[PDB]
């Protein structure tokens, strides 16, 4: 379709060397297209210069037949070595088109928004990416490997039939690759019904085996050995019923294949004999005719699989092309500026409202003040509706009315990523890449040497605990590493924040862990890194007994700013912590 | 080793039917070889006869060279009808010799003894069958596909090459093979080094995608779009480097096979050129050369698995033969009697010592006695040993000290199966066949009807519960079926005793279930149908509350008998319901 173009003219296509292997790709494949119908002419080349009077003229091998009994070899090996080494390079020439198009589509990835990465499977998109990648591998492996040479090998032997012997040989050698081709696909589509047969019943037999091993005391307590041997043996037996359609069939496919070329091969030389005995050919052309059919019938494995694959390999392909169809909806706006860092920090959301599913909204006509260089924080009941406020600030949504102004300046008129750079964000949930300790402390400004990680970690607070690991900084941690408490990860986050630096600092419900004094002892480092440097710090917390400290508080009750005020005037409110 | 002959002169070689196959497999393995070398000779008889002085003797095919022509063909098409009938044929003597060795080795695996059972794996034993069959299937198919077949034309094709032309054709014929086996050996082996490489950078490359996109909010916080690309394209990068060498591996491994067979062939043209030019031979004999030469290049596709597979395929065949050479421990005493079901069953533990781990004893020094037709009760804490006194009864162990009497006859001296018929049980974890309800019921007594089933769900009051499920009573139920909660189970075992009808009762610790309502609902059930047929029922509880009302209760502490009572006098013990 479509998409047959949009790869075969964009990615093997692009710069001087790739298309040089393209080229010698190519080059290759004709050449040993060449090699290959040389062989059989080269053979017929030998019949006929042995086959004179032999007592009378001829006298030696390497006078009388040398060079064709060595240019027949040659040609045979480098036949072989021109195919083998096409592939070898047309591997490589998809292999880098595969890289350009994964890499670009995982960049496509990596800029779509929020909204879309949160509506599909974490495994849904790589999979995707994955299955395209092998979809353009089969499509321009199939073609290149065994189609187009096929084709083109099927061109010049009904080529060469036709100039040297008549059109009724180039007529019989189409019919049969015509027969041949309609068999195996036919006869292919068929068996993957036998097979599937067959794998079921092998389950079966199976799910009996161990499900009479499983409940074995049940099998033993009501004497059901027997019974359990007869239920076992009746789906083995089912199973063998059904491996005898497989290998039958199979039989039928293979013996299919050899009628349809034996037939030819002997109608063709009943018809090389009709010509021989007529004086126009010699006893080699009969030796051309076989080998070069022949010689067809050899590359012809691949047309049991080709139908399918090909045709989900498209299925394959399609999608990973769509995945780079999909439309940002965050647009950066044109002639933008990178803005309001050297200023003081303040945030002014006027008027704003948002929420997920439109119909339904969270945030209602709110509007609050976050002054330069303070710290302010915000406080309600749990899911009130401020986790939002990270995801309105950061940019990563748009508020369906209203604005939000970062220094009488608004977010969408700066750069995307002057801002995404000016925030620095405490998640609730710190993610880790499976990967060392020092590197997740690096993922804040990856351009940071090791000192300013140590540094970074030491005014966190972890430098302790990655000493105490056993490999030290390069402890794996991860899902697949050494698994540490909520605490060390919260100062992880902590770490991030230190070693990125930025103007604008968020603290988003970094207070979930469960256990109070750790979350003391991040509530102070917290305090120390933010405090002396003019750090224009929010906290998003669902207890405002941990932040009750905090130079402005302001109250949520479900998107609207209620009041502004300090510790004690805000507990008169319920959720007190005499409870706790 | 051992293994081949255990397997080849037993499982294949049993019936007359199976013998006839056999001998057909191999007829049919002989005919198709013997066709495949005439298939070179009749083209050689082609060639000279149509290799005459055209214009003075030869008129028309069908009088000069039309048999051969036929033969020709016929020989080509009857030499692959004859393999793939070989192979069909074959086939189905594996398939069936596997289900004898399959179904006589889960016969034995049934007989084993329960401490063979618990100390191995659910899916140990069956995977052990799989592997077990799947390597016989391997070995017998390669034999007899394959290995063979190519030893056999290698010998036909060497001996037809010595009787005609001599004994350097034979010689540069096995040298030909020998070193076409070797390379291929030699190359797949180091070939998979190369495929590893590529499989384990291929999951890095897919690793760093799907970890960058798990983690995408982190990626765009910290602004690392860019670098996380980067890491995915050197990923990338280091798996096409790694299948270069793949491709590139496989290019010289075709490439070095046909340079093997084509210097061969062209060896042997330049030594059948020799020969036609000192009158020996004629240009058909090169034909002959050549194609016997080239039909032995054809069916080496097997070579490169066969060495690692075979291998495996004996050890995964030697771990199967090892599970028919288990003993049981549990042995029939010699002349067995079934006895003492018509005397009124009573149970005398005499001096009995058991326990797992023999060195930790369980039961100490321990006598009691089950009076004939009584409603008994076993008490004590959890763990306290009581949940051996099955165990032991049931003869899935033996007392190492110690006897036990069912009516003044030692249980190791009657029949196994006598006892295991006279006893009926409920089990603690009532285990669940995935098939229907219907069956489930069924399993007590699988030669009763559905009416008996009816009757049996009646006692038990089940058919309330199983005409509201919506099948009715072929309601799939299992871990993939409709999940039923520990009172539905537990009827569902009680039923099955009530199907089984034995005379001996148990119910050891049917009162797991956590709701005390539907216990007492169970207590009820089972106390009618205990009642009134002279049923000698014991019952292992945790709860003496719920079996107070047994005519004799014994209470356990740790291996001993210490009294013997009735309810009030029991509960001056401790564990009392007055906390419940």
Redesign the interface.
């Given at each position: 379709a479509i998409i047959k173009q949009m790869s075969r003219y964009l990615w093997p296509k692009d710069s001087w060397s790739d298309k040089a292997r393209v080229l010698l790709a190519l080059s290759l494949l004709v050449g040993g297209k060449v090699l290959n119908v040389h062989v059989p002419f080269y053979?017929r080349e030998?019949?006929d210069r042995?086959?004179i009077d032999?007592?009378a003229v001829?006298?030696?091998?390497s006078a009388?037949?040398?060079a064709v009994?060595?240019a027949?070899?040659a040609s045979?090996?480098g036949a072989?070595?021109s195919?083998?080494?096409r592939?070898?390079v047309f591997?490589?020439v998809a292999?880098?088109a595969i890289?350009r198009v994964?890499?670009q589509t995982?960049?496509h990835?990596?800029?779509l928004d929020?909204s879309f990465?949160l509506s599909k499977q974490?495994?849904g998109?790589?999979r995707a990416?994955?299955r395209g990648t092998k979809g353009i591998s089969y499509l321009l492996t199939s073609m290149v490997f065994h189609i187009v040479p096929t084709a083109l090998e099927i061109g010049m032997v009904c080529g060469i039939l036709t100039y040297q012997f008549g059109w009724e040989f180039a007529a019989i050698t189409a019919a049969t690759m015509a027969a041949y081709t309609a068999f195996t696909i036919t006869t292919t589509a068929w068996r993957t019904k036998f097979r599937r047969q067959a794998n079921a019943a092998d389950n079966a037999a199976?799910?009996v085996?161990?499900?009479?091993?499983?409940?074995?005391?049940?099998?033993?307590?009501?004497?059901?050995?027997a019974?359990?041997?007869a239920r076992?043996?009746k789906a083995?037996?089912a199973?063998?019923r059904s491996?005898?359609k497989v290998?039958?069939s199979?039989?039928?496919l293979?013996?299919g294949q050899?009628?349809i070329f034996?037939?030819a091969?002997?109608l063709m030389?009943?018809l090389g004999?009709?010509g021989?005995?007529?004086?126009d050919l010699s006893?080699?052309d009969?030796?051309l005719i076989?080998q070069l059919v022949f010689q067809l019938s050899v590359p012809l494995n691949f047309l049991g699989s080709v139908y399918r694959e090909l045709r989900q390999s498209l299925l394959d392909m399609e999608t990973l092309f769509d995945l780079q169809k999909v439309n940002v909806t965050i647009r950066e706006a044109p002639n933008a500026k990178p803005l309001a860092l050297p200023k003081g920090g303040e945030i002014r959301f006027e008027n704003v409202t948002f929420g997920y599913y439109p119909d339904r909204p969270i945030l209602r006509n709110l509007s609050l003040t976050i002054p330069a260089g303070k710290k302010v924080a915000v406080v309600g009941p749990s899911g009130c509706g401020k986790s939002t406020l990270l995801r309105l600030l950061?940019r990563?949504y748009d508020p369906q009315q209203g604005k939000i102004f970062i220094d009488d300046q608004d977010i969408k008129s700066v750069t995307l990523?002057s801002l995404?750079?000016s925030?620095?964000?405490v998640?609730q949930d710190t993610?880790?890449?499976?990967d060392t300790v020092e590197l997740n402390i690096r993922?804040?400004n990856?351009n940071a040497t090791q000192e300013q990680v140590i540094a970074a970690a030491q005014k966190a607070h972890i430098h302790e605990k990655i000493i105490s690991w056993p490999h030290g900084y390069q402890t794996r941690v991860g899902e697949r590493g050494l698994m540490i408490s909520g605490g060390e990860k919260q100062r992880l986050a902590v770490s991030?924040l230190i070693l990125?630096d930025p103007p604008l600092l968020f603290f988003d419900q970094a207070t979930s862990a469960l256990d109070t004094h750790t979350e003391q002892a991040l509530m102070a480092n917290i305090n120390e890194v933010v405090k002396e440097k003019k750090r224009t710090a929010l906290f998003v917390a669902h207890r405002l007994r941990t932040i009750y400290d905090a130079d402005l508080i302001i109250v949520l009750k479900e998107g609207v700013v209620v009041e502004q005020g300090s510790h004690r005037e805000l507990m008169e409110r319920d959720g007190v912590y005499a409870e706790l």
């Open positions: 053979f030998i019949i042995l086959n032999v007592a001829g006298g030696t091998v009388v037949a040398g009994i060595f027949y070899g045979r090996i072989v070595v195919q083998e080494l592939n070898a591997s490589s292999q880098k890289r994964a890499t995982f960049g990835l990596l800029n929020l990465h974490t495994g998109l790589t990416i994955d199976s799910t085996a161990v499900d009479s091993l499983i409940n074995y005391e049940a099998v033993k307590y009501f004497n059901n050995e019974y359990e041997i076992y043996d083995l037996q199973y063998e491996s005898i290998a039958t199979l039989a039928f293979n013996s050899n009628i034996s037939s091969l002997t030389m009943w004999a009709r021989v005995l007529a004086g006893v080699g009969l030796v076989n950061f990563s990523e995404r750079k925030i620095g964000v998640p993610p880790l890449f499976n993922y804040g990856v991030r990125k």
